[PDB]
Ligand binder design. Structure first.
Ligand SMILES: [Zn+2]
Lengths: 187, 397, 49, 98, 397, 397
């Protein structure tokens, strides 16, 4: 027994519920496709879903405000947050080369009549920074000392493997100019 | 008029779309429009009829809105909607008939019935919805003062005329030269005849002209021009110009020579076709001028030569004709064509309810008289009644 | 005014169901031994061993 | 109604933004872009229910009236079930409205 | 039938409105309708054909839904939609052909194909959508026992009939009085002839009448009436009434006199026009009575007086004719007209698949016989097949 | 083409639906589409014209989006929309004219104007709305190479040709026998005549045949077949075959005997009708073969025996005939017809702006020549220009 208006509200609620049937097929499709096809991960549906199982599917419509167009501050914050999350989820490297042995060989080869900042902490930090910056599309600037031609040698590989649009243009041109004018044109 | 069209359009859409089992997402917007119409019409009182035999009717609106919370409509919803739809359709029907049956010599384009005058008010402007039919969109364009156009298939642009003109004549009608014509609906049949077959004419060629002016300019017209007037190719006994006596016409058909068809606008040749039959296009014209010659055959086999002697006794009369049919056209003003039923609807309503003859239209909505004397007031009233007829036909069948 | 006939309705729904949220607790995922983990080209990611 | 409050609540509930810092031109751009998006179907349907029934809800209310006709003339009190005699006007017909 | 129409309408909307690049707000509701159609049809098996040479085809429905999370739909969306649209269009095609190639003496309105019988189930009712077409509108109306109206451009209402009546005749066939007529489609063409030119008739006037009864009541019809019958104005050699001999007809045309064209409804005169030609309106009628007179010309020039002697030998035979064309009309029942192609589609399908002649329709869907004997069962079956043919044409050419 | 059609459709909907007082829910989707169009078209520059007398025009787009924050539209909203709509409509008009007045020998289906080529880019695909119209639907189907179909009322498929063949003849033209036909638009009138009236023919029967091959395949065509050729049943003086003399034709009409109408595809009889007149159906054909006979009446009254002697002085010449009208048909290719106005629109634009004769279409868009030599390139260009003309007609009337 309801007023017509109350009945309208309740009827709308009853007729437009957000719950939908859930099955192993829906769960499997919810798993990202690339992960499903990757042979490194074995996925099994070891659970039985009764017929009376429901779920509310997320609303994953792509952004309607286009915060990447003319929202510099908001986009900077968004990219920073995604970068933090990606850093959290990137794995940690294991059994790196012995830092002391590598430092000793580098010092012997370079014969510095440079080796500062080389260690496992820095290696892991760089791994995470690269992967997370690529995931979040955070622009990453390059910090280096032009006198450290070893750092420039490493930056050669950096630029080879990391797309050039991931670096702020000034930093990219600085690194490339240092490389050319201290190694390549000189050689 | 826009409000009336919106009412009829809403009711037609409700009839078409509110059906059992249909998703409410299919008719959400329609039901919003229907509720808006009900809200706007509630609490208002209307009167229709009172002219001729059309009964005086009173309309009151105290309806309840329609539900908006089902996922799929059910039978209950359809019946609840239909009960209101019937009353609204009846109201629209009677308002349309009341508007059709009326006319005004001054400001014929404005509403004439009191119901439509009331709907002209600002309070009812909330009922507008859509204006997508040909006649309503032309109405709106005309009010906005832009170019309008109605596309007609076989437009009745020629007032019915059937007559002849004799350039050479005698009391005995034994030796005649002239033309005969029928201009009817969307066709012109003209036939120039000479009894002597141009025996004594200069260069044995007789020239014939026929000018048909139109009451309105036709644009982008497709026309069929054919070289024979089949209506004037058999023996006939016609009555003299003054009706005193009767004369005989025993035609023998020759090919029309030097056929020229000119379509003129403001007295200047816009299109011109020479010795070309079949489908032609007249882009913009208000007069059709047809010129054609009877040329005596320079060479005749004996059977042909025996027909045309050089003395008075003439038993066969050389005739050359043209037939011109306007298949399609576009006109700024409303007309009657072979495809639409608006003239039929208006005339049928007036005849059914025995409307006394008014100060504008001819008796019985005689299209021949109307298009003969197509005046500004007549055009305005005719467009108004045709628009109302289209609005009514959206609902009544 | 209160009208019983116009106020009495019949509301229909489901008898019972369970609504889940995680949607991935039903997926049991293991990882191949890291040494023999292949890249997109079906060769070991680290093949300098 | 300041849509800047709505935009601030939006950014706040996004949970990653320090709303006090967002520049002003960007806040107004966000308002402009939000004003252009079509409403979601469930929310719009609920709003349609409320907008179609709000007149009736207000009329049903007991602590307010819809207006007062003055009319400066002797008008017989109407007789109603809810109360013997009342100055109930059921429509403002025939009176200029302010 | 409504479910079949809705399947076709939603498929047409999908094939028109699902085009790459279009905003999703343009197809939100259409995609809701399409997904509901897919959900309802899924898990169903239909069988079509098996009559005549129509192939026996099986239809299993298992399709995924169309996506909803997209702003502007792209090539992937269009491809995935069109793959399903093709199958659904083919299924609708075959269902419609199966329906068209069948007839039933009893319950000709009820679905005949087992596929349409299945679709009549209440489970499929959720796909109803909007019944906006003229034929589906009329289908619903006649289901509810409401007024139906079909607008036709020159409807095919007169069964073909080319004949002549001889009110006066003898074996020599040299002194004949009577009428000739051709009724066909929308044109009546009648011509009363008298070999004696009413020399010995009272007041020198011969009366001719022509009654054409329609099988159905036409409403709001525009009619073009002309005063000559060009078909019976040239010399003819006609075989006698019993085929024993042949007689010669050498006409000379006079204007019809005291023309009266009256349109009657159940014997009552609803409309009447006296000596008026051009465009006229018949508001509601089912019989046409054309009365005209051959009046011997009171005054004649010698070239005419020679034609009509007092004695027997009548070389020239006086003839007065009328031509009547129903340009446009409205009918409660279904008919064949010039513009529509429903008769053509039904006949084409039956001929293509060599459907044996059933009990209801005449062989080869002969329209002359179908309209000469337009029984209620024939009307029911014809309306069903025409409605399904329009549904089919909504998707297929 | 699809994008241009979408622009025209969006503007037509804007003019129809954006009216004062209308509920915003009646327009919301259209407003989203319109703002999408404004966003896409902003910042682009277009140039139209420069061919013939068509003025050069430059178009720049910088418009604000229409609002979305009202309940009912007011005068402000309509006024703001109208200026944008007017500019866009003028732009669409000029683009359509510029595309219509152009043609190409190679790739005639491809866009020819700079504006349409620009619109064919990928940045403009965001405006597609809905391709509901028949011509755009067939355009998309032909691009996908699905089967297209256009329905025509009285299609213009027979190039105008009036001619005659003489199987028997002599210098004096006293004892001719043969056929005499007019093919024009949608009508074939063929008369077979014999001056001797089959006195010496085998079995007193003279056979007549007439073959009309169509340029394109017609489908599901409704035909009207009648047993006389009214056009060829009155006395005529006709130029001889080589034009060096004239002969006399004085017909007397008999019923055609053993009439057989065949509609043939690839030389195979698809439909055959024997001695059946009136409405008939041809489901699929590309040639029409009319066979008939003149049978000397076995029995004659004196008035006929006099007409038909044994010797050479034949004064009356026996004639049989047939008339065949294509009331409505379907064709995969585009054609001119009575009802539509696309050919008239194209020809009108070309004549108005004095477009020089190009390498594809005949001068003045002469339909006779075009259909006579309807090459694949002409079909492509004609479909392109007709589709553009339809797009234009959606806005211009
Ligand atoms: Zn027609």
């Amino acid at each position: 027994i309801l007023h017509p208006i109350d009945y309208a509200f309740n009827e709308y609620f009853l007729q437009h519920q957000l719950v939908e049937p859930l099955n192993n097929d829906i769960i499997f499709n919810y798993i990202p496709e690339r992960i499903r096809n990757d042979v490194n991960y074995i996925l099994n549906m070891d659970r039985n879903l009764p017929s009376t199982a429901r779920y509310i599917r997320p609303n994953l419509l792509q952004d309607r405000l286009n915060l990447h167009d003319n929202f510099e501050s908001l986009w900077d914050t968004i990219t920073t947050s995604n970068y933090i999350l990606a850093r959290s989820v990137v794995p940690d490297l294991k059994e790196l080369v012995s830092t002391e042995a590598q430092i000793q060989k580098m010092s012997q080869d370079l014969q510095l009549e440079f080796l500062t900042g080389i260690n496992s902490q820095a290696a892991n930090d760089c791994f995470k920074t690269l992967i997370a910056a690529m995931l979040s599309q955070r622009t990453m600037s390059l910090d280096f000392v032009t006198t450290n031609y070893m750092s420039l040698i490493s930056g050669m590989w950096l630029l080879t493997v990391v797309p050039n649009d991931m670096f702020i243009r000034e930093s990219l041109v600085a690194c490339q100019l240092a490389i050319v004018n201290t190694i390549i044109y000189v050689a | 008029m826009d409000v009336l069209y919106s009412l009829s359009k809403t009711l037609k859409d409700a009839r078409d779309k509110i059906v059992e089992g249909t998703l409410y997402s299919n008719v959400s917007d329609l039901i919003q429009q229907f509720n808006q119409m009900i809200i706007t019409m509630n609490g208002n009182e209307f009167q229709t009829g009172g002219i001729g035999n059309l009964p005086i009717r009173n309309w009151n609106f105290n309806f309840g809105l329609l539900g908006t919370t089902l996922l799929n409509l059910d039978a209950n919803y359809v019946e609840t909607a239909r009960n209101t739809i019937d009353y609204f359709v009846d109201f629209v029907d009677n308002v349309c008939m009341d508007e059709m049956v009326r006319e005004s010599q001054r400001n014929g384009i404005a509403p004439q019935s009191d119901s439509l005058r009331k709907l002209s008010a600002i309070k009812f402007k909330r009922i507008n919805f859509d204006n997508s039919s040909e006649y309503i969109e032309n109405w709106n364009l005309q009010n906005r003062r832009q170019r309008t156009g109605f596309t007609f298939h076989k437009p009745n642009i020629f007032p019915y005329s059937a007559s002849f003109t004799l350039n050479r004549s005698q009391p005995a009608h034994d030796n005649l030269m002239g033309t005969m014509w029928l201009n009817a609906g969307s066709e012109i049949q003209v036939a120039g005849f000479d009894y002597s077959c141009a025996i004594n004419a200069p260069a044995n060629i007789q020239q014939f002209e026929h000018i048909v002016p139109l009451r309105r300019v036709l644009t982008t017209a497709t026309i069929t021009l054919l070289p024979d007037a089949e209506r004037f190719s058999f023996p006939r006994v016609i009555n003299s110009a003054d009706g005193a006596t009767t004369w005989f016409f025993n035609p023998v058909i020759l090919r029309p020579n030097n056929v020229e068809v000119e379509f003129l606008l403001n007295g200047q040749i816009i299109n011109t076709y020479q010795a070309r039959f079949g489908t032609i296009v007249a882009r913009n014209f208000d007069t059709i001028r047809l010129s054609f010659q009877l040329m005596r055959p320079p060479n005749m086999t004996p059977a042909v030569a025996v027909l045309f002697p050089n003395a008075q006794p003439f038993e066969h009369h050389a005739t050359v004709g043209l037939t011109l049919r306007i298949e399609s056209a576009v006109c700024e003003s409303v007309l009657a064509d072979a495809s639409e039923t608006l003239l039929a609807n208006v005339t049928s309503v007036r005849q059914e309810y025995a409307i006394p003859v008014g100060p504008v239209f001819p008796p019985g909505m005689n299209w021949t008289d109307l298009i003969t004397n197509y005046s500004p007031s007549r055009e305005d009233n005719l467009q108004r009644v045709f628009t109302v007829a289209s609005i009514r036909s959206m609902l009544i069948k | 005014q209160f009208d019983f006939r116009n106020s009495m309705h019949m509301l229909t729904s489901n008898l019972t169901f369970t609504v889940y949220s995680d949607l991935l607790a039903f997926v049991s995922a293991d990882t191949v031994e890291p040494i023999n983990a292949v890249a997109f080209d079906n060769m070991r990611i680290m093949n300098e061993l | 109604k300041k849509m800047k409050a709505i935009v601030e609540d939006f950014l706040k509930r996004l949970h990653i933004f320090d709303v006090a810092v967002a520049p002003d031109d960007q806040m107004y751009r966000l308002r402009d872009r939000l004003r252009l998006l079509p409403v979601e179907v469930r929310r719009l349907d609920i709003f349609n229910l409320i907008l179609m029934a709000m007149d009736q809800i207000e009329r049903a209310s007991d602590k307010i009236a819809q207006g007062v006709i003055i009319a400066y003339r002797d008008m017989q009190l109407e007789r109603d079930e809810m109360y013997g005699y009342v100055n109930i006007a059921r429509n403002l017909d025939g009176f200029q409205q302010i």
